[PDB]
Amino acid sequence: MGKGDPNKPRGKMSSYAFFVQTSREEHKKKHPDSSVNFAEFSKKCSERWKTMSAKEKSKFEDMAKSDKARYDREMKN
Numbered sequence: 001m002g003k004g005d006p007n008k009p010r011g012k013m014s015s016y017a018f019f020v021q022t023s024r025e026e027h028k029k030k031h032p033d034s035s036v037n038f039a040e041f042s043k044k045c046s047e048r049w050k051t052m053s054a055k056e057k058s059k060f061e062d063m064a065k066s067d068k069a070r071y072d073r074e075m076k077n
Contacts, residue, residue: 012068015060
């Protein structure tokens with residue numbers, strides 16, 4: 001609806017975005033000569049994120065809501 005703005009801030013994030021952001025940071029540790037683009041990796045992380053349970057996904061859902069609520073106390077109230 002309205003993410004990129006000229007002066008206003010941007011939208012919020014989510015747990016699905018932190019998954020590829022945290023899974024990509026743990027790739028260079030064992031992938032110095034490997035091209036892991038977003039699709040070449042987001043395709044594999046989706047197979048695990050879709051099978052992951054609430055016991056593991058909770059670690060990403062708690063980090064996404066922490067920033068998602070911060071946007072409510074920025075332009076409104």
